[PDB]
Design a protein around this ligand. Structure first.
Ligand SMILES: [Fe+2]
Ligand SMILES: [Fe+2]
Ligand SMILES: [Fe+2]
Ligand SMILES: [Fe+2]
Ligand SMILES: [Mn+2]
Ligand SMILES: [Mn+2]
Lengths: 286, 286
């Protein structure tokens, strides 16, 4: 449907808008290029691994590649909904969000190619709970926005996308990967990639917090909605975590070899901790 | 609706895809930031102008600010349609397309703020023909893709967006602005902005050419469709050009003052020339 007018012809960008300020930061700090990462050492490292050390790494890489791909694709409806509501600064910021995700998908896919598992189908490490979140709930909640951009639909989208997928699962997965492979001294290029990624994702969660909070601010009721959508997903979050935990426990060599005490009961608590932490960034009134 | 799987878990990005290669170039050459442009001289220049020299510049700025805003918003459905068709490399490239446009809107809006016309409503320089293209035909053709992503709907979208708006009108408008204000020595910051912009837009047109050509390649019939949608818009293109021409002719001082022979009959022929040129980049068979 038509345009009514244009904000930058009638007025200007709102230079003080919190999302314009996040946009300015995204440009300043968003310069990294996955094509510049030297993966030659990751290649040698992965080859040097035994065939069962090799698979120890792959479940997490399978959850991330798919994860980054899904969120690259599934942010588009948010951008549309907010655009149609006239929230131009939000939209400007979301262009950097989307391009960041594109680079995240790119980065993992380059790592897979370079270490020589590009031809390998990693779908086999997505259990039913992973599919529920990434193959199903994430795209259902975002796509809904094309026909329903009610406060309730926008809170639920930002909750599933930003608070659970990015704010709980990805955050914990970055922590985990660094806890394990940084201590072993493995996969320097990938870890460099993860670090850049982790920095981008700091902005992304700030958009979700801003979005959920500005809706909650209109009406307290929406707070209980937020808490509820969080608790609804939790079973699928921990059920993916158990599945991974249980995979990694039946492969103990890399932990033995590189001699790393993978405290699964410490990772598990980080997930639990991230989740509660996200709840605390939304207040019933603010 | 659900995801079936993920290309970067089953396989990798198609590193040889023409849109992945355009994505890589966009990252390398897409580093400019409008926030870094020094507009202090543009401010002094605009103040130094007489009040009727001042308005000589504004119609074109009004067509561009709105123009950049519209295309920032109206590329989203293309990204969605291609995403839903599984064209991941296209989508990656389109993240850079969208962010480029965000910066284009940003750049003009900064120029308006800096020269002190930010509070001025420039909508008054959008005649009926401009509205037909930008307020109406552009968003109708893009949004259609949400419900109809037939070859025919995708060709028409790329034609209106990339071949007419960007490939004909914007291209000509950049040429014009540089023909006039570069020769006068005015508005150095804006021209710097326009130059960066013109470089980004080289990639954008290559996506539209790629998109139209890959559809035409399936079936010659679509070529006549392409030519026809081009010819349908032309009246609105030249009717905006006459309106501008006719504005600039009833303001002759800046042309007198800065002593520039604004050959309107040379600009007019550039528009005609860009248009035919775009037709020639699509072949009935290739
Ligand atoms: Fe993210
Ligand atoms: Fe289960
Ligand atoms: Fe463009
Ligand atoms: Fe007319
Ligand atoms: Mn990401
Ligand atoms: Mn542009």
């Amino acid at each position: 449907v038509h345009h009514d007018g244009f904000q930058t012809v009638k007025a200007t960008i709102d230079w003080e808008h919190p999302m314009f300020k996040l946009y300015e930061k995204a440009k300043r700090n968003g310069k990294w290029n996955p094509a510049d990462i030297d993966f030659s050492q990751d290649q040698k490292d992965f080859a040097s691994l035994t065939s069962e050390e090799k698979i120890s790494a792959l479940p997490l890489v399978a959850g991330f590649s798919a994860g980054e791909e899904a969120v690259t694709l599934d942010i588009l409806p948010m951008a549309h909904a907010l655009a149609r509501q006239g929230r131009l600064e939000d939209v400007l910021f979301l262009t950097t969000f989307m391009h960041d995700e594109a680079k995240h998908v790119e980065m993992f896919s380059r790592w897979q190619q370079a270490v020589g598992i590009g031809q390998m189908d990693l779908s086999v490490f997505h259990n039913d709970h992973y599919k529920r979140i990434f193959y199903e709930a994430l795209p259902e909640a975002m796509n809904r926005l094309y026909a329903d951009d009610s406060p309730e639909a926008v809170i639920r989208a930002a909750t599933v996308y930003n608070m659970i997928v990015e704010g709980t699962l990805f955050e914990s997965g970055y922590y985990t990967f660094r806890q394990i492979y940084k201590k072993a001294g493995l996969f320097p290029g990938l870890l460099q990639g993860i670090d850049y990624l982790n920095m981008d994702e700091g902005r992304h969660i700030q958009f979700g917090i801003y979005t959920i909070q500005r809706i909650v601010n209109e009406d307290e009721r929406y707070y209980e909605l937020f808490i509820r959508y969080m608790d609804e997903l939790w079973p699928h979050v921990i059920g993916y975590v158990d599945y991974l935990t249980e995979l990694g426990k039946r492969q103990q060599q890399l932990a033995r070899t590189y001699a790393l005490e993978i405290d699964y009961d410490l990772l598990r608590h980080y997930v639990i901790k991230q989740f509660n932490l996200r709840k605390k960034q939304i207040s019933r009134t603010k």
